[PDB]
């Protein structure tokens, strides 16, 4: 059907039909009069796991024969959402399964429904280590992602009553077709026990154990034949565990709760035992896999181990990886500290993804010490030492020796897991221009002062398979018609697009599409969720994790500004919008659910209002996750990227949006600083406080009260959500709200608020002239190039693991 | 190599080898460079069960079409052990699949040890629900068998310092290539909660629910291309389920902890409340299954549901059936009392097992009131109209009402479920002749006065496929070079082999096989076990589980009188033996522990004695299971069926040494009668009490003493075991052995003991015989036809299922 889709031909789609018909026969055991769309799917899936299969395994005996210096991405989280359409656009199979499947009576894209996503991640975090994934492939990396495989992802979440509920997300109850199970390299995994010293050094005695099995999931490039690995550990009792005996079985589940469900905290650090025995987990599991490796390849020699071997640290998360490295090279290998300390610092890097105090990992000391007793041990070592050369370096400076402690003192004593990263690794970098340059500012200028060639910036990006040639095929399609379809994986082409800003040909497609797209997902909406919207008006999207700082409630007090404008004169033009707002709070996190039950609670109020008509309609998209994404953000005109400057590290979405054709609206924060940089401020909507107009507020104190007395419209809204209009029969429902903005809020939404409306009229008056809405359309998608996750991955490549990036096509 | 093993075909072999190579490379992702002898057992075993997919989808439809009365055999165990080398003999695959692997360089039965048992049973009763599945499909019958998957089967024991450590049966590590998950029939199973009553009858409500998901697993039939279900269901939480969050979704644990693990008991009853879960689970899952199947076969006439359905409760462990079906038909589908009664009876049949009083099922009142509030009315309300039948036919007679009752009055109220399966049943059968006139005589007796019609025999059998052909094809082979193979679905034809027992060809052929046998078994013990035995001594062996009545003990008495008289007179020729026992005990059965403690005991002091030398050997056979009987049983020369008369009810071991070439030692107890019977007694060793001479001691009353007094190297053994003489470490280790056999035997081990031991004189004379010994052995297994579990199956499908077995070949 589309060029970029790849070729049907009739040997390809007889050979898929005939695939098709055996593991229905054969693997689901089923025939065509019991099959139900299900049974269809998983015949597709195995069809097209059978082409990944020889190019798997003669990648990884390539990478034995020339033996590269092997890169090793740790991550709790790998945020893969679905996999079946992403295999047939990196293997150029898509029209060939799309005319095979038709052929049989089927319809691909409803069969693609079916796939459950992989939900192993939170968010921004999670999708980065996927969008890696696929990059370090793409530009043929030996790289491979090790993680957890959670039995249990991030919860599905349903609105009851318009508050969220949250189901357990069973995501492998119909079987898994893309893993492979690898039983035979299982490996132990110490807790507890305690330290003896003998003569000969200190040894880890009378542990506990869990063993450690992985399981395999294919990373196929982009069409060059490559296919890494992601490699994820599952819990297991050993055989002999516990062992009245009933019991002693019935609590194996004791072990195998390590590996059964992600911590469902988004930028929020929770101190509990069962997430230090996670992170611990994939540490030891992962480092032991990587040694074993590094032996096999081509008496011991680690002085070359960090020529082979780099480790990347996805957070803090997996730091323990230090400790761990220096425990086996010191206890295990018997080399000197200083020969260990040397070959860490060298193989480990660590990129830190936020500011944020409540997200900093600070481990209690009397938790290390039962659980992890020898790794406490060589903690306090590793800070001796470093401590010993902060002082050699500023002698005399005693608040800076406590300042940069890996130990930190008070009620409880805590080990700070950023410092212990900093001191542990060759390289630290933040994830957009802002963000690095506030971590040598502020949190970590200790650090950058003792250590000035350790810091670096490495800016976000996104995948442009996933993100536009998988999502968005009809955008996709016609960038290759005017430039061919090299610019796939290398995403700079766009520029070329700039030359067809005045195309009226060019400008008539670009807005096609998106009305294509917005009509496709009004109808998505109407078909699983009952919901009915105008598909000619504005679609105003904010979509990610609920959070304070991200200000979802700046969207909101917009969001009545409007009604309450449209009520006092009805009979006015206004451009009609329709605003959608989704996204998961942590279950734990109560004004998260609040803001959720606020957000519901208007659209209660505007979509039934008889004199508002469809002018403005308010929805809250159920279940937000990457299946989700792909759906919504092709659709969107108005990308909202809106939290307080200074505190979103770099943002991704924003990527997702802009390469999609939506304008932004937003802060100078994070990445958008730079998206607008490459556009030029022109075709950006900025407004609000900079960085150090956030800092001089802080100076003088900042006092909500002021903005509520100045501002009549503020103080309208205010007034509404006290009184109970949005919650007539609970009118003090959103008192916590209300208290929380006028008195304790640290984000600042009241400061913005007026900006941030004056901004939107703007926005409104662009979309009333299509022809200009759409060419700033175009300078935003022609601009989006630097924000691909390629050059992201190039970046890491040269600047920090010292390997070269290779397009170069391995033998099909 | 062999003709029972079927065509070596050119094009065959050639498929056969293709396929193994495809799996290896697609289902395994490997290549020959990195595969492991357990890589190529999945290749093929993946291989052999491509053969059996297209016969088991045509099998389901032929039923579907066909329509017939459906079997379905509830069991809480299936003792299956291993499936490959089955399904090559029931397809005729062996000798193809052999050639196949060895032209890749391959040894087939290397790879044949690398499958996992499917342990999913105790011992008779668990082999029984085996054998009946194979002869089922070989008989053509549209049958089911329904069960627990449980993740963790019957423990594996490992023997260390002479005494039975547990370690968990983890046999789904790997995987399991034989099974098909369907969680598109996954079912709910209610427990708790309470009843409600309406205008419109009982409600039971506020219950918990946990999904049933069913696992299938193929049954091929003897070279008939039928393929019949056995359909297993694992317990799952709901999504929903205790839905702060993450201990939500820990706390899944506890609904799927139901089938976690194998009950490892035998011949005893364990009242605990997981248990009891356990048995509601299957039938609650499995009669949704069967009614669904009825509905949407071919408003709904019940009436027509027992020509359709036929339910076989193997033992009272499924008992809940009977009102399980009645709460359906009358609380669902609002059937009235009598009618649904009725249905009810004409449905359910009942085997029984045991006459233990320790074996029977009496479960608290109390725990069916908290888990079951609505099955405790329905079996009150049975009982009440059952009482009122019984004081009908015996008017006046009160103690029979209070003897018939299926609640049990006392220090806590139980309720009977033999007593609720004979009322519910319209059959009621025991194992063997002797075990269902027992029944009639003594614990069933009133039941029988009332209605005398309900009781049957059915005697026991074994499935001449995997316990002839599969475990012995030397012997097999010699017999189908004289009488052709149509024995192996026909057994009663070995009758022809009497023909034969003046041969000299023959009888040299029978020799020699069973020689090989214990050659091929010696050798096995040395490589695993590193145990050195004499292939020229009798094979003198007693595999079962260990349980008191089963005798262990008089065994062990003799192996030290045999010690004991070599000693005495060392330079006196004695016929040389190697005894082996072997067998599990449950975990919490102490004397059974006990036991096992003496016979390694007794091998520590007899195998090292230097005067005795190779003239005896006493080996403890570890962890005896299905796999280990198919080697063992073949190698046999003497068979120990050792029971006190009346305990055992038939036993399944002595018809598999019968079929191979062993002659038997036993008592008048359970089949060995018929065994007898059908060999003549001539050809038997037959020695001891029968259940009228245990009956005269009992009403006298048994005292041991009378028998130490009187037997002087009784004495000696006694003594020897007070005084240390078996623990010169621990001098009192067996004084709980002593104390029992002196003070408290149930089961009459001193009463026996002379009779036993004259008798194993005459096996001793008649093995110097070399030819008589043969010729003795050929009388056996010529008369061995009768034990064939087809001629039981047969029996069941005219008597009490009625409907017609079938040796028709469906088409290929
Ligand atoms: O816990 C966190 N979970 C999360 O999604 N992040 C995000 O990481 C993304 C990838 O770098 C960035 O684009 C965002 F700025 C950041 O908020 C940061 C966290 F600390
Ligand atoms: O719990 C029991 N576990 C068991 O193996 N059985 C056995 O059942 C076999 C099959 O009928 C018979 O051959 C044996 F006589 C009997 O002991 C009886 C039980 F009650």
């Given at each position: 059907?589309?060029?970029?889709?790849?070729?049907?031909?009739?040997?390809?789609?007889?050979?898929?039909?005939?695939?098709?018909?055996?593991?229905?026969?054969?693997?689901?055991?089923?025939?065509?009069?019991?099959?139900?769309?299900?049974?269809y799917?998983?015949?597709?899936?195995?069809?097209?796991?059978?082409?990944?299969?020889?190019?798997?395994?003669?990648?990884?005996?390539?990478?034995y024969?020339?033996?590269?210096?092997?890169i090793?991405?740790?991550?709790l989280?790998?945020?893969?959402?679905?996999?079946?359409?992403?295999?047939?656009?990196?293997?150029?199979?898509?029209?060939?399964?799309?005319?095979?499947?038709?052929?049989?009576?089927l319809?691909?894209?409803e069969?693609?429904?079916?796939?459950?996503?992989?939900?192993?991640?939170?968010?921004?975090?999670?999708?980065?280590?996927?969008?890696?994934?696929?990059?370090?492939?793409?530009?043929?990396?030996?790289?491979?992602?090790?993680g957890?495989?959670?039995?249990?992802?991030?919860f599905?979440?349903?609105?009851?009553?318009?508050?969220?509920?949250?189901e357990?997300?069973?995501?492998?109850?119909?079987?898994?077709?893309?893993?492979?199970?690898?039983?035979?390299?299982?490996?132990?995994?110490?807790?507890?026990?305690?330290?003896?010293?003998?003569?000969?050094?200190?040894?880890?005695?009378?542990?506990?154990?869990?063993?450690?099995?992985?399981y395999?999931?294919?990373?196929?490039?982009?069409?060059?034949?490559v296919?890494?690995?992601?490699?994820?550990?599952?819990?297991?009792?050993?055989?002999?565990?516990?062992?009245?005996?009933?019991?002693?079985?019935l609590?194996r589940?004791?072990?195998?709760?390590?590996?059964?469900?992600?911590?469902?905290?988004?930028?929020?650090?929770?101190?509990?035992?069962?997430?230090?025995?996670?992170?611990?987990?994939?540490v030891?599991?992962?480092?032991?896999?990587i040694?074993?490796?590094?032996?096999?390849?081509?008496?011991?020699?680690?002085d070359?181990?960090?020529?082979?071997?780099?480790?990347?640290?996805?957070?803090?998360?997996?730091?323990?990886?230090?400790?761990?490295?220096?425990?086996?090279?010191?206890?295990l290998?018997?080399?000197?500290?200083?020969?260990?300390?040397?070959v860490?610092?060298?193989?480990?890097?660590?990129?830190?993804?936020?500011?944020?105090?409540?997200?900093?990992?600070?481990?209690?000391?009397?938790?290390?010490?039962?659980?992890?007793?020898?790794?406490?041990?060589?903690?306090?070592?590793?800070n001796?030492?470093?401590?010993?050369?902060?002082?050699?370096?500023?002698?005399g400076?005693?608040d800076?020796?406590?300042?940069?402690?890996?130990?930190?003192?008070?009620?409880?004593?805590?080990?700070?897991?950023?410092?212990?990263?900093?001191?542990?690794?060759?390289?630290v970098?933040?994830?957009?221009?802002?963000?690095?340059?506030?971590?040598?500012?502020?949190?970590?200028?200790?650090?950058?002062?003792?250590?000035?060639?350790?810091?670096?910036?490495?800016?976000?990006?996104?995948?442009?398979?996933?993100?536009?040639?998988?999502?968005?095929?009809?955008?996709?399609?016609?960038?290759?018609?005017?430039?061919?379809?090299?610019?796939?994986?290398?995403?700079?082409?766009?520029?070329?697009?700039?030359?067809?800003?005045?195309?009226?040909?060019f400008?008539?497609?670009?807005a096609?599409v998106?009305?294509?797209?917005?009509?496709?997902?009004?109808?998505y909406?109407?078909?699983?969720?009952?919901?009915?919207?105008?598909?000619?008006?504005?679609?105003?999207?904010?979509?990610?994790?609920?959070?304070?700082?991200?200000?979802?409630?700046?969207?909101?007090?917009?969001?009545?500004?409007?009604?309450?404008?449209?009520?006092?004169?009805?009979?006015?033009f206004?451009?009609?919008?329709?605003?959608?707002?989704?996204?998961?709070?942590?279950?734990?996190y109560?004004?998260?659910?609040?803001?959720?039950?606020?957000?519901?609670?208007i659209?209660?109020?505007?979509?039934h209002?008889?004199?508002?008509?469809?002018?403005?309609?308010?929805?809250?998209?159920?279940?937000?996750?990457?299946?989700?994404?792909?759906?919504?953000?092709?659709?969107?005109?108005?990308?909202?990227?809106?939290?307080?400057?200074?505190?979103?590290?770099?943002?991704?979405?924003?990527?997702?949006?802009?390469?999609?054709?939506?304008?932004?609206?937003?802060?100078?924060?994070?990445?958008?600083?730079?998206?607008?940089?490459?556009?030029?401020?022109?075709?950006?909507?900025?407004?609000?406080?900079?960085?150090?107009?956030?800092?001089?507020?802080?100076?003088?104190?900042?006092?909500?009260?002021?903005?509520?007395?100045?501002?009549?419209?503020?103080?309208?809204?205010?007034?509404?959500?006290?009184?109970?209009?949005?919650?007539?029969?609970?009118?003090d429902?959103?008192?916590?709200?209300?208290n929380?903005?006028?008195?304790?809020?640290?984000?600042?939404?009241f400061?913005?608020y007026?900006?941030?409306?004056?901004?939107?009229?703007?926005?409104?008056?662009?979309?009333?002239?299509?022809?200009?809405?759409?060419?700033?359309?175009?300078?935003?998608?022609?601009?989006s190039?630097?924000?691909?996750?390629?050059?992201?991955?190039?970046?890491?490549?040269?600047?920090?693991?010292?390997?070269?990036?290779?397009?170069?096509?391995?033998?099909?």
């Amino acid at each position: 059907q589309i060029s970029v889709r790849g070729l049907a031909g009739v040997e390809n789609v007889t050979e898929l039909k005939k695939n098709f018909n055996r593991h229905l026969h054969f693997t689901l055991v089923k025939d065509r009069n019991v099959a139900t769309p299900r049974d269809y799917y998983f015949a597709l899936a195995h069809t097209v796991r059978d082409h990944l299969v020889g190019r798997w395994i003669r990648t990884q005996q390539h990478y034995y024969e020339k033996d590269p210096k092997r890169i090793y991405y740790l991550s709790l989280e790998f945020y893969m959402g679905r996999t079946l359409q992403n295999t047939m656009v990196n293997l150029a199979l898509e029209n060939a399964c799309d005319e095979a499947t038709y052929q049989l009576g089927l319809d691909m894209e409803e069969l693609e429904e079916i796939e459950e996503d992989a939900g192993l991640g939170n968010g921004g975090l999670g999708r980065l280590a996927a969008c890696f994934l696929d990059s370090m492939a793409t530009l043929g990396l030996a790289a491979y992602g090790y993680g957890i495989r959670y039995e249990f992802g991030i919860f599905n979440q349903k609105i009851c009553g318009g508050w969220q509920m949250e189901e357990a997300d069973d995501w492998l109850r119909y079987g898994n077709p893309w893993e492979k199970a690898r039983p035979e390299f299982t490996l132990p995994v110490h807790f507890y026990g305690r330290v003896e010293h003998t003569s000969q050094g200190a040894k880890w005695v009378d542990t506990q154990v869990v063993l450690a099995m992985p399981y395999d999931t294919p990373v196929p490039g982009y069409r060059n034949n490559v296919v890494n690995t992601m490699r994820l550990w599952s819990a297991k009792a050993p055989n002999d565990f516990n062992l009245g005996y009933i019991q002693a079985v019935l609590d194996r589940n004791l072990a195998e709760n390590i590996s059964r469900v992600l911590y469902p905290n988004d930028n929020f650090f929770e101190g509990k035992e069962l997430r230090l025995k996670q992170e611990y987990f994939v540490v030891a599991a992962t480092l032991q896999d990587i040694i074993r490796r590094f032996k096999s390849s081509k008496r011991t020699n680690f002085d070359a181990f960090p020529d082979k071997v780099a480790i990347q640290l996805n957070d803090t998360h997996p730091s323990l990886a230090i400790p761990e490295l220096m425990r086996v090279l010191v206890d295990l290998e018997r080399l000197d500290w200083d020969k260990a300390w040397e070959v860490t610092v060298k193989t480990c890097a660590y990129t830190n993804h936020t500011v944020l105090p409540e997200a900093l990992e600070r481990w209690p000391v009397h938790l290390l010490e039962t659980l992890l007793p020898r790794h406490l041990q060589i903690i306090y070592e590793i800070n001796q030492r470093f401590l010993n050369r902060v002082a050699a370096a500023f002698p005399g400076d005693v608040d800076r020796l406590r300042r940069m402690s890996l130990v930190e003192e008070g009620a409880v004593k805590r080990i700070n897991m950023a410092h212990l990263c900093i001191a542990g690794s060759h390289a630290v970098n933040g994830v957009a221009r802002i963000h690095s340059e506030i971590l040598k500012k502020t949190i970590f200028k200790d650090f950058y002062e003792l250590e000035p060639h350790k810091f670096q910036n490495k800016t976000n990006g996104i995948t442009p398979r996933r993100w536009l040639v998988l999502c968005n095929p009809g955008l996709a399609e016609i960038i290759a018609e005017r430039i061919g379809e090299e610019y796939i994986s290398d995403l700079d082409q766009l520029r070329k697009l700039l030359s067809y800003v005045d195309d009226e040909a060019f400008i008539r497609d670009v807005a096609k599409v998106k009305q294509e797209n917005k009509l496709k997902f009004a109808a998505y909406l109407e078909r699983e969720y009952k919901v009915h919207i105008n598909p000619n008006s504005l679609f105003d999207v904010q979509v990610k994790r609920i959070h304070e700082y991200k200000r979802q409630l700046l969207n909101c007090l917009h969001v009545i500004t409007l009604y309450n404008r449209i009520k006092k004169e009805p009979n006015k033009f206004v451009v009609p919008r329709t605003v959608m707002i989704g996204g998961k709070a942590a279950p734990g996190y109560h004004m998260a659910k609040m803001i959720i039950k606020l957000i519901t609670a208007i659209g209660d109020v505007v979509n039934h209002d008889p004199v508002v008509g469809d002018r403005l309609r308010v929805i809250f998209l159920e279940n937000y996750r990457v299946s989700l994404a792909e759906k919504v953000i092709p659709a969107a005109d108005l990308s909202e990227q809106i939290s307080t400057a200074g505190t979103e590290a770099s943002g991704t979405g924003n990527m997702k949006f802009m390469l999609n054709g939506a304008l932004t609206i937003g802060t100078m924060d994070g990445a958008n600083v730079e998206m607008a940089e490459e556009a030029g401020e022109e075709n950006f909507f900025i407004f609000g406080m900079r960085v150090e107009d956030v800092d001089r507020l802080d100076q003088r104190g900042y006092n909500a009260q002021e903005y509520y007395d100045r501002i009549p419209e503020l103080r309208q809204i205010i007034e509404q959500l006290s009184s109970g209009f949005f919650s007539p029969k609970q009118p003090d429902l959103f008192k916590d709200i209300v208290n929380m903005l006028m008195h304790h809020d640290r984000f600042k939404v009241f400061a913005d608020y007026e900006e941030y409306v004056k901004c939107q009229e703007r926005v409104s008056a662009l979309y009333k002239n299509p022809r200009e809405w759409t060419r700033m359309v175009i300078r935003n998608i022609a601009t989006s190039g630097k924000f691909s996750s390629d050059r992201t991955i190039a970046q890491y490549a040269r600047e920090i693991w010292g390997v070269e990036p290779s397009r170069q096509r391995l033998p099909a």
